[PDB]
Subunit: 443 residues, 4 copies
């Protein structure tokens, strides 16, 4: 229903990224325009992938959502929305079938399809294959001392051509970038977890071959990869390398998990920086460096069966090496394998591996580089973009028109809480964003 804006027109809103966060904004805008639900803006979305896809590099077989399907992209804002997960199922003729599953945790493949089904209804306003590379200040009058729009430049991921689009307002919703240990070198055989399903098969084409494959880390991504490798490459020898002493379980308990409630964002944001830092630390185990207990137990059971076959752990096909860090990687010459050097992680062993899967998490700072050509518009003394409660970043008012602005989505954990980077509050936050950006225009 949302109609396209011509590429060279002045947009009202341009969103960088079309993952769940921008999709929830698109959905919330649709719903706010729906006479059936409420009491058209010139909008477009740029997405570097060639079609909608949700962490496709980590769609390992059997992987599940880590959040109740009720926390979809609409329901917590309005269960009557056409964009609920249950309505998607009903449109697919699968609602009763999903009901008989008796699970709150769909396969990630299914929840990706739900979001693909939503995203297809916005295809007229999404430009796929466009990687935004810079955002530059615009002036309607060149002799004005005030920026009143932004030019967003994007690179065609197939041809390299640079496109430009003008917009009053920008949303940056680009998720995370791979965090690599600084000491690891670049090599086609060292692959971050985010590119597991998508590039490792190309590297290791023979599923029956006895590859040596190592996994670095001990959070959910590492555990899913380590566990999947033993099925994907049944004759491989896999090694899980972690600096902790053990995989530790994610905190799914209900009182702790109320920090993810949508209505907590007001209170979290109003707290002092010192309190927000302490709170995030105390609740870290709900999300970071932890594994769903059910997957830990599965891996533990697999280890036990190896113990039944051979009591000597050093002889096991699949091994966990706890409290170790990689200190050196040899990787030159035509030989297939790298030599990983391991030391204790407390305050030498070597391994010959065909590939090293690096499951060491994500950073959420890439908006600083994307926004570098407008960062002179920030107030003096800021080395970082500062979002208000409504996610609009602070601009020097002598330099930027009140009609122009930039909002950040998904990189605001420090100011808005641990739910900021997840699916947890997207339905409600998308509704807040539509009111913040479009509210006056709608009325």
């Amino acid at each position: 229903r949302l109609r396209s804006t011509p590429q060279d027109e002045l947009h009202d809103l341009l969103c960088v990224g079309f993952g769940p966060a921008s999709l929830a904004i698109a959905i919330a805008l649709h719903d706010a325009l729906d006479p059936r639900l409420n009491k058209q803006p010139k909008i477009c979305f740029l997405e570097r992938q060639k079609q909608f896809a949700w962490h496709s590099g980590m769609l390992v077989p059997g992987s599940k959502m880590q959040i109740s399907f009720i926390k979809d992209l609409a329901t917590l804002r309005d269960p009557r929305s056409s964009f609920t997960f249950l309505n998607y199922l009903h449109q697919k003729g699968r609602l009763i079938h999903f009901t008989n599953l008796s699970t709150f945790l769909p396969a990630r493949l299914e929840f990706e399809d739900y979001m693909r089904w939503c995203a297809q209804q916005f295809s007229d306003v999404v430009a796929y294959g466009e990687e935004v590379v810079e955002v530059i200040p615009g002036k309607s009058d060149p002799s004005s001392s005030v920026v009143d729009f932004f030019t967003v430049r994007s690179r065609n991921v197939e041809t390299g051509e640079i496109s430009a689009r003008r917009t009053r307002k920008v949303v940056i919703a680009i998720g995370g970038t791979a965090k690599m240990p600084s000491g690891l070198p670049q090599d086609p055989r060292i692959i971050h977890s985010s590119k597991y399903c998508t590039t490792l098969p190309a590297l290791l084409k023979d599923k029956s071959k006895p590859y040596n494959i190592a996994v670095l880390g001990s959070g959910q991504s590492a555990a899913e990869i380590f566990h999947d490798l033993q099925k994907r490459y049944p004759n491989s020898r896999t090694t899980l390398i972690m600096r902790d002493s053990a995989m530790r379980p994610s905190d799914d308990s209900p009182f702790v998990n109320e920090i993810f409630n949508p209505e907590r964002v007001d209170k979290f944001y109003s707290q002092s920086a010192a309190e927000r830092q302490r709170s995030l630390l105390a609740d870290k185990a709900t999300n970071y460096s932890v594994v769903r207990l059910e997957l830990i137990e599965e891996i533990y059971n697999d280890m036990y069966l190896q113990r039944v076959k051979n009591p000597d752990e050093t002889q096991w096909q699949h091994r966990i090496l706890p409290e170790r860090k990689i200190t050196r990687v040899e990787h030159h010459g035509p030989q297939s394998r790298m030599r990983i050097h391991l030391k204790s992680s407390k305050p030498k062993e070597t391994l010959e591996v065909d590939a090293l899967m690096v499951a060491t998490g994500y950073n959420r700072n890439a908006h600083e580089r994307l926004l570098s050509k407008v960062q002179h518009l920030r107030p003096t003394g800021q080395d970082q973009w500062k979002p208000h409660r409504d996610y609009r970043v602070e601009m020097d008012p002598s330099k930027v028109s009140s009609e122009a602005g930039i909002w950040l989505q998904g990189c605001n954990e420090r100011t808005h809480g641990l739910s900021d980077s997840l699916l947890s509050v997207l339905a409600v936050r998308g509704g807040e964003m539509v009111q913040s950006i479009f509210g006056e225009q709608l009325e």
Copy 2:
């Protein structure tokens, strides 16, 4: 949305009973008239003084036995405003229920949801009306053809009789208590359906060492037996069952596809012999079975008695399996009742202060209620025959086409094990609205 019809007018439809089945029809009619989602003269008569859902069995901790997705609207249209999720959103409780991580709300909570739905229809529901007669009406003195029905109800407070005229009747009156034959009439012999409303009046002192027997081994018997040991901590309770053990309900996913709304067509279109065979083979999904978790809790309570005393005969709370009651003897209120037991195979004497009889329900009450119109059935029929759309066969030479009677909730034999449950109410509500109002709504 549904406006009252003056009590004197010729109604389009009168529904007898305002339990979940009739409520689902009201909701389906509301949704069919809702321009977001897509007036007849309708009224409902309910004997209870307000909406209430097996209030006599609202024992503490009792839970739904069916996923909340099978509420009164979602399987027909997840966008409906009458979904359980939207009810939670309207109550400010949606996020809190999400953190519960359960498909099975407390029965108390699901009653409040349906009561919240029911309040939307307060203009078209007359509470405290017990329907006692359905009378054939002939608007033409010069024709013996019946073209409407007069429904007579007795007000439970005044006892006055009121009459309403309607073209069509829905009979949606649930079940009546099934009692073993030959029990004496004694206020201390109480059917499970009146457990919460009658037993506390009879046994007022919660600390007294009452002897309380429970007859049966299905879900009602297990919930009552388990609850009595908490409600009367010093009581001596006895579960009497003719089976050798409580058996677990079948909640496995392939078997339970028989409850899918789209299976109604398939079940109906089978011969009487195959329908009868089907119901028998699948009986363990519903009848004479207990949810495994409750079985396990009762078993653990029994085990703890064994820890304290190895002699089962001296336990406070006991199960007497493979027993039948030969008679319940009484000598007035001055003394306990005496339950005489023998083997249920093709002996004990119990002295009790009350006998909870959890022996299930019959769904044949519509036969008495419709006795004054049964001469309009085709020659030879001794029971009402519903077609697929739930309308009973009438002799077409005796009843007009504008007049009809439908049955809801008593049609297991022709429509499947889901008929008496919540399982297909949302979808069946939609079909009923089509069958009864479809043309009227098309014009």
Copy 3:
């Protein structure tokens, strides 16, 4: 420590079979001989070359269906050296098993536990011996009374016949494959009991798109159906069942009291009518049922196919309910058989490279084995009748009291649903040692 008896001597007891039932007797005799806890001339004959527990069905990930406490000793004496926990302690694995927090070891692990037990009786077990007949013996040329038995066994690898003489015999030979009568004999039609041992030799290319059918809907059919989809990832598998659905086994605690060892006394004393009715009423504990967790796993795999394609007819792996096989075309050089299906209610065909037949077992094989002594039964018996202590009725005028035959594992009709399982083996082994050797040990 059970010492061997010279083969030509007259044994006190000869046991046919060395599966868990006979093994539980050996363990109970060992424990009865141990003054720490509290020698007859005994020998066991086993057709397999070593101890093995349904090796043809040791599917990856398959689990015990009974708590490890019902091992081969604990319910009779938790102090026994032959408990599962002591075995783990001896293996250095007890703390590691504890951390699993499960009552259900892998079948592979429980087999190893019983193998560890069985290796301690190697002095009294002859493997590779298939018993073929039991013939009566009369040690007195002047009396017509049978007072011993000769057990004749064919060596598996040499085919040579050996004769062993014994006063008492135990038959503990488990079950035989039950096949639907209308199926023909073909290398591509394999009973579930030979899944792991026979199917790989027939279907050698783990990556080829075979069509593989599975007949039945009990635990065996479910385990094979689910496993085939991993073992042959490109196969098209089909579960053919005459019921409408896989149904869950009853593991609920009151019902499962029927497996309690002390229940055998009460069950045995019931009438034949009551025992038959009782067995029927409790059938869902054991027969034609699937553990709920596995049903749900199979259901979830079906659901994921529906996510990828809503048309069930085009799914890789399918279930075909309320079907019966009316005909199999298997003659010809074509690698695939054609299966003809009809409704099982009182024209579709499948072309398959193999049909796995998971249709259960019979436990009547002792009738053929004992045929040369069946004239010793009392008149008017067409079956062997076990007493409570598992000794079969013999005509007193024909058989001396110091001679007898006991049956193990085939007495469900008289001793209850626990008879064929591991459930009462520890306790039953103790009772058997008392019945067979009790007067001898006192």
Copy 4:
């Protein structure tokens, strides 16, 4: 089979305390003397309580063990022992019935009965009702300057009379003592969790009275008390006061829990003090200030039901006050209720309560007072007892004979790991203790 030594004789070993730690030693000595298990020392145990009892003040209805029954007092050392939990069940005629329970976690009540069954076989070497008060040095030749025995002085609970027993070797196995926040005054209405079942009923006799009852803390003891009070006093208003933001789940994941393995004691002890501290910190959530998830979920569901009835948390019968600390208690005067003053626990609110349950944990320092009169025998420069791997404390060899010594049990978490104070390694540690104390004597 262990026979009494006359009270006035020189014992080989005297154990202070007869809880699970001392009982495990008694069991290991018995097994070491059994020719079945391995092909008599003068020993006595002194126990303050009148019979064996295992945290009887916290035997709340429904409380369960938090460790697999396989970790009983013998099995991990020798599954053949007559003192295993499975053998105890067999002796009681309950083994099959417990098997049908399908649980690794007996009721605490049942596990206490198991240990009482073990303890009663040592009744000839245990003096109950004896509170040890001091350990004093002994010189068999008083003119010499070498200590070669110890006199253990104990107060008879019934008569207060002091008796003295002499021994070469002493074991201190006295568990923990109630830890109270230093700011709380002494008052009969302020009760530590350790005395909940035994003292609170004496204080609040009428189970139907609407008492106000507060609970301080958020570990397992606070959760069990908070949950139990709501059943024990159905009309009470209970309040859980915690300085954390929420109850947090205990870590029962299997890799982490390998720290409780008996064979890990060697690994843990052989680490530096820095690394022992760091590791105890990393694994703290297995044991301290945490609650079993299933209990958290049950309390959460009870709170949810209150919310169904009334969305305003301030009106709930039972409430949780997070991030609070008690700053003042008013408790002088004849009024039934104390006034508790609360403030935020972050770096005006009052409650009036009939009682305050203090679930603030335990200290394990009480051995230092009992050994004060021998702490001059430590080597020069120690102000704390230093146990070696085999749990014997370091003595100055020029002052203490090699045939005399003191061992500590249960208070050595610092040096021996998180399992030290639990049942986790008692079977194995008992065997080790028998070898250390009586090894040469038996060989």
